[PDB]
Amino acid sequence: AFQPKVQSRLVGGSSICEGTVEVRQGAQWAALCDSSSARSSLRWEEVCREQQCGSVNSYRVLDAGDPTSRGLFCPHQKLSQCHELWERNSYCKKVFVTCQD
DSSP states (O other): OOOOOOOOEEESOOSEEEEEEESSSSSOOOOEOOOOSSSHHHHHHHHHHTTTOSEEEEEEEEEEOOTTOOEOOSSSSSSGGGGGGEOOOOOOEEEEEEEOO
């Protein structure tokens, strides 16, 4: 196994356990684009736990319908299943996540 790890962090929160999700894999931090059609709390529970911030309490989407937003895209269900990130250079929908603590 042992493949490199997509890292995640939350920026701009009113605390360190909430904020807009960014990812890096080898590096350059950028907003995570999420292109799921049903909303699932599965990724955000992983992100919150990885921040050591406990469970996810809520999440919301940002930048819906902005053809100019850009960030980095993971084509698998869980970030911990990605070992590689692609640029998405238009229509990046991002996610603001609020963790437990």
